Design an enzyme around this catalytic site. Structure first.
Site, PDB file in Angstrom:
ATOM      1  N   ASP A  43      -7.219  28.403  33.947  1.00 41.49           N
ATOM      2  CA  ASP A  43      -5.837  27.936  34.019  1.00 41.49           C
ATOM      3  C   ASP A  43      -5.343  27.581  32.623  1.00 41.49           C
ATOM      4  O   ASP A  43      -4.679  26.564  32.436  1.00 41.49           O
ATOM      5  CB  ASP A  43      -5.717  26.736  34.967  1.00 41.49           C
ATOM      6  CG  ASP A  43      -4.275  26.462  35.389  1.00 41.49           C
ATOM      7  OD1 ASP A  43      -3.471  27.408  35.455  1.00 41.49           O
ATOM      8  OD2 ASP A  43      -3.938  25.287  35.646  1.00 41.49           O
ATOM      9  N   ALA A  73      -2.019  16.455  41.333  1.00 42.91           N
ATOM     10  CA  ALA A  73      -2.360  15.203  40.670  1.00 42.91           C
ATOM     11  C   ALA A  73      -1.145  14.429  40.201  1.00 42.91           C
ATOM     12  O   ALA A  73      -0.096  15.007  39.886  1.00 42.91           O
ATOM     13  CB  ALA A  73      -3.288  15.463  39.467  1.00 42.91           C
ATOM     14  N   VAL A  74      -1.288  13.109  40.134  1.00 42.50           N
ATOM     15  CA  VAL A  74      -0.276  12.261  39.510  1.00 42.50           C
ATOM     16  C   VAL A  74      -0.921  11.426  38.419  1.00 42.50           C
ATOM     17  O   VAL A  74      -1.990  10.834  38.625  1.00 42.50           O
ATOM     18  CB  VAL A  74       0.417  11.343  40.538  1.00 42.50           C
ATOM     19  CG1 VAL A  74       1.169  12.176  41.565  1.00 42.50           C
ATOM     20  CG2 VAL A  74      -0.597  10.442  41.212  1.00 42.50           C
ATOM     21  N   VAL A  75      -0.294  11.395  37.248  1.00 42.81           N
ATOM     22  CA  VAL A  75      -0.941  10.831  36.055  1.00 42.81           C
ATOM     23  C   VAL A  75      -0.161   9.640  35.506  1.00 42.81           C
ATOM     24  O   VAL A  75       1.047   9.737  35.298  1.00 42.81           O
ATOM     25  CB  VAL A  75      -1.115  11.914  34.962  1.00 42.81           C
ATOM     26  CG1 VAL A  75      -1.939  11.371  33.793  1.00 42.81           C
ATOM     27  CG2 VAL A  75      -1.814  13.145  35.561  1.00 42.81           C
ATOM     28  N   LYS A  80      -5.660   9.921  36.097  1.00 44.78           N
ATOM     29  CA  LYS A  80      -5.302  11.019  36.980  1.00 44.78           C
ATOM     30  C   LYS A  80      -5.677  10.614  38.402  1.00 44.78           C
ATOM     31  O   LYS A  80      -6.807  10.201  38.630  1.00 44.78           O
ATOM     32  CB  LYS A  80      -6.038  12.290  36.523  1.00 44.78           C
ATOM     33  CG  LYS A  80      -5.613  13.607  37.147  1.00 44.78           C
ATOM     34  CD  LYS A  80      -6.099  14.745  36.207  1.00 44.78           C
ATOM     35  CE  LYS A  80      -5.775  16.111  36.764  1.00 44.78           C
ATOM     36  NZ  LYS A  80      -6.455  17.206  35.993  1.00 44.78           N
ATOM     37  N   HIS A  85       3.234  14.702  36.709  1.00 50.71           N
ATOM     38  CA  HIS A  85       3.315  14.960  38.133  1.00 50.71           C
ATOM     39  C   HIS A  85       3.035  16.438  38.379  1.00 50.71           C
ATOM     40  O   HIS A  85       3.649  17.303  37.747  1.00 50.71           O
ATOM     41  CB  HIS A  85       4.707  14.577  38.655  1.00 50.71           C
ATOM     42  CG  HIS A  85       4.832  14.596  40.143  1.00 50.71           C
ATOM     43  ND1 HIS A  85       4.374  13.569  40.940  1.00 50.71           N
ATOM     44  CD2 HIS A  85       5.389  15.504  40.980  1.00 50.71           C
ATOM     45  CE1 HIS A  85       4.631  13.850  42.207  1.00 50.71           C
ATOM     46  NE2 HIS A  85       5.246  15.019  42.258  1.00 50.71           N
ATOM     47  N   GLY A  86       2.106  16.730  39.279  1.00 48.67           N
ATOM     48  CA  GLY A  86       1.919  18.090  39.748  1.00 48.67           C
ATOM     49  C   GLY A  86       1.673  18.097  41.239  1.00 48.67           C
ATOM     50  O   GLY A  86       1.625  17.035  41.878  1.00 48.67           O
ATOM     51  N   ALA A  87       1.502  19.288  41.804  1.00 47.30           N
ATOM     52  CA  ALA A  87       1.172  19.401  43.213  1.00 47.30           C
ATOM     53  C   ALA A  87      -0.145  18.707  43.523  1.00 47.30           C
ATOM     54  O   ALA A  87      -0.327  18.176  44.618  1.00 47.30           O
ATOM     55  CB  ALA A  87       1.106  20.865  43.635  1.00 47.30           C
ATOM     56  N   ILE A  90       3.162   9.405  33.609  1.00 49.15           N
ATOM     57  CA  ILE A  90       3.116  10.419  32.550  1.00 49.15           C
ATOM     58  C   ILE A  90       3.407  11.806  33.088  1.00 49.15           C
ATOM     59  O   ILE A  90       4.165  12.571  32.502  1.00 49.15           O
ATOM     60  CB  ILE A  90       1.738  10.504  31.862  1.00 49.15           C
ATOM     61  CG1 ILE A  90       1.388   9.231  31.108  1.00 49.15           C
ATOM     62  CG2 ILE A  90       1.717  11.680  30.890  1.00 49.15           C
ATOM     63  CD1 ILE A  90      -0.001   9.310  30.478  1.00 49.15           C
TER      64      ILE A  90
END
Ligand SMILES: c1ccc2c(Nc3cc(C4CCC4)[nH]n3)nc(Nc3ccc4nc[nH]c4c3)nc2c1
EC number: 2.7.11.1
Length: 274
Positions: free
Chosen positions: A132, A22-24, A40, A18-20, A16
């Site tokens: 945030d 976390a991956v979901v 997550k 992608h970040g620095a 679903i």
């Protein structure tokens, strides 16, 4: 193939997000396949910081149950892995919704802001600041699919990895958030409090109204310098905007947090009624 976390399952093919940090993945309840979840996980490219942020988000989210906060169903924290099993919101995030719609009507903005306000009442009463808030961290739930009203859409705040408690006689000073949605006091490396979140809400509302963030720069540094040089900030608001929404925006988008709208004023603003 299929991975399991408690009573939930997912496959890593169903990415679903992608970040620095976390991956979901999309997943489901093992016994009720129609119960969708978002799982997550650590981003191993930034292992240490990702593990730390997910651990912290578990701690905060355990305390925050609300219809307009993306819910933590379960979690699994171990020495070398962390998983959060989250409520699945099928409507995606507000940023993408705004790209599709281009702008939102004032009535829709009111419906969304009422809901954000309800979640913010809970954070405020708990003494938590999010830090945030941005359209990418507002998720939309549309259970009625194509046959849904505007009133049908539920808006929910996500990503509490940067949140903290702030005692009422203290100020925070950690630099975090996203530059375009950061309060001036935050990006200028000054002390700040919960009113920083109110600036971020103001920027989100402005973007709903116009399709753009209110103050744009070619870089974070350039945005900082802009805030530093300009003691007065007035966002450009479309002339046809209703007077109550305009007043709300101008109160939230005050450069100086001393002049800025506070929580009681925000919670009771007439725009949130009619
Ligand atoms: C189409 C349909 C659904 C989604 C979606 N659904 C989610 C995400 C979550 C929770 C996991 C943390 C929130 N629950 N439901 N998410 C996304 N992108 C995303 C995924 C993680 C995010 N964390 C902060 N902002 C995020 C933005 N796109 C979508 C596109």
């Amino acid at each position: 193939g299929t991975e399991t976390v408690g009573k939930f399952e997912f496959s890593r093919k169903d990415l679903i997000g992608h970040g620095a940090f976390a991956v979901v993945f999309k997943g489901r309840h093992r016994a009720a396949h129609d119960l969708e979840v978002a799982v997550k996980c650590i981003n191993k490219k930034n292992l240490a910081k990702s593990q730390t942020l997910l651990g912290k988000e578990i701690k905060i989210l355990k305390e925050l149950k609300h219809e307009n906060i993306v819910a933590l169903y379960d979690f699994q924290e171990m020495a070398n892995s962390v998983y959060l099993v989250m409520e699945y919101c099928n409507g995606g995030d507000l940023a993408d919704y705004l790209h599709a719609m281009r702008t939102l009507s004032e009535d829709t903005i009111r419906l969304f802001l009422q809901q954000i306000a309800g979640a913010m009442r809970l954070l405020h009463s708990k003494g938590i600041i999010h830090r945030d808030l941005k359209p990418q961290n507002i998720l939309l739930s549309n259970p009625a699919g194509r046959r849904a009203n505007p009133n049908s859409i539920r808006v929910k705040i996500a990503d509490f990895g940067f949140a903290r408690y702030l005692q009422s006689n203290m100020m925070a000073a950690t630099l975090c958030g996203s530059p375009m949605y950061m309060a001036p006091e935050v990006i200028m490396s000054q002390h700040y409090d919960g009113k920083a979140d109110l600036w971020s809400i103001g920027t989100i509302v402005y973007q709903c109204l116009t399709g753009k963030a209110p103050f744009q720069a070619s870089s974070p540094q350039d945005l900082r310098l802009f805030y530093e040089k300009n003691k007065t900030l007035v966002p450009t608001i479309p002339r046809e905007t209703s007077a109550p929404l305009r007043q709300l925006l101008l109160a939230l988008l005050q450069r100086n947090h001393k002049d800025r709208m506070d929580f009681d004023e925000f919670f009771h603003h007439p725009f949130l009624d009619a």
